[PDB]
Amino acid sequence: AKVEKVITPPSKDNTLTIPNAYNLQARASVDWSGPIEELTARIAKAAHFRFRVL
Amino acid sequence: AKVEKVITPPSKDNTLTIPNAYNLQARASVDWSGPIEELTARIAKAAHFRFRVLGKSPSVPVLISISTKDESLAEILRDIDYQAGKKASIHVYPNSQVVELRYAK
Amino acid sequence: KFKKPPINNPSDDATIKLAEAAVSVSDSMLEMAKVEKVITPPSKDNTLTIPNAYNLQARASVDWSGPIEELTARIAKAAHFRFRVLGKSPSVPVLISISTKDESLAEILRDIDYQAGKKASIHVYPNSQVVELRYAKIY
Amino acid sequence: TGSLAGLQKETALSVGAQAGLAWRAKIIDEQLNKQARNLDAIYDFNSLVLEHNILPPVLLEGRNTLNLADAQSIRISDRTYKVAKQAHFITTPPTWRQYLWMDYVKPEAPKEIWCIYTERGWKNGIDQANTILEENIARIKEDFGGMILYRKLLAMNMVSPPYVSHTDLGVTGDGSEIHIDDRVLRITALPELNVNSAEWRAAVAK
Amino acid sequence: TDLGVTGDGSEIHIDDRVLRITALPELNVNSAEWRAAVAK
Amino acid sequence: KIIDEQLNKQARNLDAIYDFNSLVLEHNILPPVLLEGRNTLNLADAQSIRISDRTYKVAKQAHFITTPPTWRQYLW
Amino acid sequence: GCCSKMGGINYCDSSAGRLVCNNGFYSTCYCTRHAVMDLQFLMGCCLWHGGVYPQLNSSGLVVCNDGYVSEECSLQ
Amino acid sequence: GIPPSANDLLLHVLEGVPPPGSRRLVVSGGDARAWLSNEKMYVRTNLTILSPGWLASMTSADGTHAYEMQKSPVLLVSWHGKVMQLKVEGL
Amino acid sequence: GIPPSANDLLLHVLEGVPPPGSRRLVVSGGDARAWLSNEKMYVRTNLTILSPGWLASMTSADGTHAYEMQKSPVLLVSWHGKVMQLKVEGL
Amino acid sequence: KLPCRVDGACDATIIKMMTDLNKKGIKVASVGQNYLISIPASALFADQSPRLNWASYSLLNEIAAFLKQFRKIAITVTSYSSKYVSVKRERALTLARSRVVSEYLWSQGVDSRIIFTQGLGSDKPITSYTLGGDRSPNARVEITFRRAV
């Protein structure tokens, strides 16, 4: 990891793509070992947001 | 993972936004796996718009797959434009109510 | 004491499996009927061909699983109308299955005419008091 | 066997299984007979028949198909359609009794550890009868679903309809036997999938 | 390799893709193109 | 049996340690296995020797996969 | 006693694989084999291989279907 | 040479009909069915198979998966974000 | 080639005379007669045969039907809008 | 050789825990497959502070022992309080209370996949009688889940 970080310095962070807002500050403890879609749908349903798949 | 992942800023994201016309918020139910032009023409006819094509069809047609039960027509058009990729684009003009399918040169 | 309201008779796993098959058969039919209705919009209704009149408003509850002609003759005889047949009956019989409860004879005749499809047709003339069954010009 | 300090009949199943199978088959037949009209309403083969008394073909659908053929190469597909059975002339529509009815014949051809193994054979026979009924239900469900899929693909213009040609002869025969009106019906084009995707028609439901 | 609607009248596939890896990974022997890493 | 019980108690740490899923390449290709040696000497016979500073070898080659490997195929 | 301190067993719901008590509560007992069980410990050898290859051997060796030799089931 | 597309038995596995000439296998611990035809397993379930690896796969419209794979007496599945095991008998 | 028109034994079945060289079958549960000649049943009745399917059919002037079909130990008939079964013995 | 039930669970034990909790004063409700546990804030915390009493850990152990009897995927912990100074202080207080309660519940061995925590402050009261402080019946913590299969 140190060698890879030295060779390729990252330049962008996903805060721009995923910003924070109100009622995204509720908290969670999760232990999940499956596919991504069901977990993302449960997080969106707990955050009271609509869910879209492209 | 932080080092390896590359992203794009949302200012220059090349994805069609929601055109927020009144006729494009009607819900639909689509099950289709085939060419893009027939489905786009049917979406325009259901949304009471006109439909026009600029470009030429290739030898191998562009194939999309849309399977939704309750989704808006604008969201369906956005998913179609995302699934088309670099080969085709969909533009929506609401002042003169038309949709345009532009092929890649 | 803790209880929850639905406590019915005990069930059978055969009926459970039949219900699990029938639910998916039902929503497959629902989706396919929706697609066919969207593709082909109907424009005409058989109220013009089968109108209602007085003494067609006596009611009936019916469970019939046989040919069309005897049931249509019984409905016409109960409605005090003459019965007429045009065309020749095919060698493979036209089979219907009707299971209703407390609906009018005009509605029964309309349902029989709809289930007959492309093989037979039902017409009603109230001025002459005539129920006519005509076979299709096929074979 | 365990710790270091720890170191320092078959005919009952066979006679129970047949009786359990026959008893469960009889109970399944009674439960099938209690719901005769609902099954006739659900599996309505009669109203799916085409114009010239032709049974519709059976179509099978698969989605999101992947095949690892060997190393270094894979083949994937979006959707696949297959014609499992082909259309033909019929005289009678099918019914659910040819699919779901199980066979019942009364078996009249017959103690410290006898009872528990007889009970085990009884449970095995009940489980076997349940498995047989489940397979029959799956078979009739496939045969109905293919005929539904044929009508949906015909609505979306992906299959071709069958084509019927009829020849009308007059009064035929010799002086010892005559036939008044003879008609010979023959279907000439079987239904098939089309590969030209430009004629496919989409449906948007409001 | 991207194939469209392929098949005969009894069985069709809508969108076929055939993926094949052409060159396996291997070590290189030309030392002039190697890149060093210094971590401060 | 005792070793199997000890492996089952520490199950969730083993998936975090031997995370084969995070090393898979773009087209679901398992990465190859490389072996490294340092400061190598060989006395083939008398009057002649051969030495090397470092050596690299490919042990297993990359291939298509459908599922990632797990620690239960090695340690159970 | 499955439905203890309740009204007793009503029937086996095979869609969920569970018993139903005489109240409206589901029971904790299983009644089909196709029920959700949290199985973590399984017995037998040549696991995570093809299984035991069914040849009868002159020696006490146990071979799996993929050519691996299981030392645990092998007689010494 | 073009690789083969799929195996056509997976449509019948998706519908639930066993392939002809096969024999049944007993599956315990979850909702799955398995058959053995040509020294290969055919599995019908709606779970996600994790460890043993499969050769071919198809998916139905309602989320049912059909797998073609080699024979093995154990399967590793994920149920709702939790990893468990299914036991296969009759091999 | 032109398909054959009919079988001429069905006229004798309609009249009620058994075909020569045949043998009798016992029918219970309804008003029907059956004969077996060439591993085929010939049935004379005025009911409507629903389930097993027939190969050839003729009809008389008074409403009696004659059927040619394969052998089967059970017939499904409709009497007056009610579906019932007929038992065939002697096969 | 196969198990005959879910381990460490019994219907009589479930009924006994529900009866004991309802007799002592913790509200346990079940409609359909949804389960709700309602706890007054005075039995857990001090006077309007996010500090647990030392004697409430027995109650938390009893709630954990009841929660181990079921199979579940997600739990929701929601906190409600009363008006003291402003809305920010009571919202932060409810969030801290839910965080501490779910931290001890996750420290104990409940076999869930996700636990969600939120504190709504004083937005949703269940009783129009709002004269009390932390002794009010509308200052509470709620634990909701759905039994799986």
Evaluate the CA torsion angle B36, B41, B42, B44 in order and state its sign.
Answer: positive
Are F49 and F42 spatial neighbours (Cβ–Cβ below 8 Å)? yes
Are J40 and G64 spatial neighbours (Cβ–Cβ below 8 Å)? no
Closest residue in E to H4 (Cα–Cα): E18
Q: Shortest CA distance to J114 belongs to which of J144, J141, J94, J149?
A: J144
Residue A20, min C-alpha distance to chain B (Å): 15
Residue D85, min C-alpha distance to chain B (Å): 24
Residue D1, min C-alpha distance to chain C (Å): 42
Task: Tell whether J102 lies on the interface with A, counting CB pairs under 8 A.
Answer: yes
CA-CA-CA-CA torsion for G11, G13, G17, G18, nearest 10 degrees? -50
Task: Tell whether F13 lies on the interface with H, counting CB pairs under 8 A.
Answer: no
> Do B33 and E14 make contact, defined as CB atoms within 8 angstroms?
yes
Instruction: Compute the distance between CA of residue J66 and CA of residue J55 in angstroms, rounded to an integer.
Output: 18
Chains C and D touch (3+ CB pairs under 8 A): yes
Burial of H83 from C-beta contacts in 10 A (0-12 / 13-18 / 19+): buried
Are G34 and J44 spatial neighbours (Cβ–Cβ below 8 Å)? no
Instruction: Compute the distance between CA of residue G27 and CA of residue J94 in angstroms, rounded to an integer.
Output: 36
Residue D203, min C-alpha distance to chain C (Å): 6
Residues near H83 by beta carbon (within 8 Å), at least 6 away in sequence: A33, H50, H76, H77
Chains F and I touch (3+ CB pairs under 8 A): no
Chains J and A touch (3+ CB pairs under 8 A): yes
Q: Where do runs of H (alpha helix) occur along B1-105?
A: 36-46, 73-84
Q: Where are the beta strands (DSSP E) in C41-129?
A: 59-60, 63-64, 82-86, 98-99, 103-104, 120-125
Which method resolved this structure?
cryo-EM
**Tokens standing for residue B92:** 């929506």
Task: Tell whether G14 lies on the interface with H, counting CB pairs under 8 A.
Answer: no
Residues near G74 by beta carbon (within 8 Å), at least 6 away in sequence: G60, G61, G62
Are B99 and B49 spatial neighbours (Cβ–Cβ below 8 Å)? yes
Task: Tell whether D61 lies on the interface with C, counting CB pairs under 8 A.
Answer: no
> For residue C3, which residues of chain G lie inside 8 Å, CB to CB?
23-24
Element (H or E) spanning J95, and its range?
A: helix J87-107
> For residue A17, which residues of chain B lie inside 8 Å, CB to CB?
7-10
Residues near E2 by beta carbon (within 8 Å), at least 6 away in sequence: B60, E15, E16, E17
Element (H or E) spanning D125, and its range?
A: helix D114-155
Task: Tell whether G47 lies on the interface with F, counting CB pairs under 8 A.
Answer: yes
Interface list for chain C against chain G, based on CB atoms closer than 8 Å: 2-7, 10-11, 13, 16-17, 20
- Best mutation target among B31, B39, B63 (most E Cβ atoms within 10 Å) is B63
Resolution for this model in angstroms, one decimal place?
2.8
Closest residue in F to G40 (Cα–Cα): F8
Element (H or E) spanning D38, and its range?
A: helix D36-42
**Tokens standing for residue H39:** 């020294």
Q: Is J123 left (phi over 0), alpha (psi -120 to 50) or beta?
A: alpha
Instruction: Compute the distance between CA of residue H80 and CA of residue J113 in angstroms, rounded to an integer.
Output: 9
CA-CA-CA-CA torsion for A39, A40, A45, A46, nearest 10 degrees? 70
Radius of gyration of chain E (CA): 22
**Tokens standing for residue H18:** 């066993």
Residue D71, min C-alpha distance to chain F (Å): 6
> Do F62 and E21 make contact, defined as CB atoms within 8 angstroms?
yes
Element (H or E) spanning G29, and its range?
A: strand G26-30
- Chains with 3 or more CB pairs under 8 A to chain J: A, C, G, H
> Do G18 and J149 make contact, defined as CB atoms within 8 angstroms?
yes
The vertex-H8 CA angle with H2 and H12, nearest 5°, equals 160
> Do D206 and B26 make contact, defined as CB atoms within 8 angstroms?
yes
Closest residue in F to D66 (Cα–Cα): F66
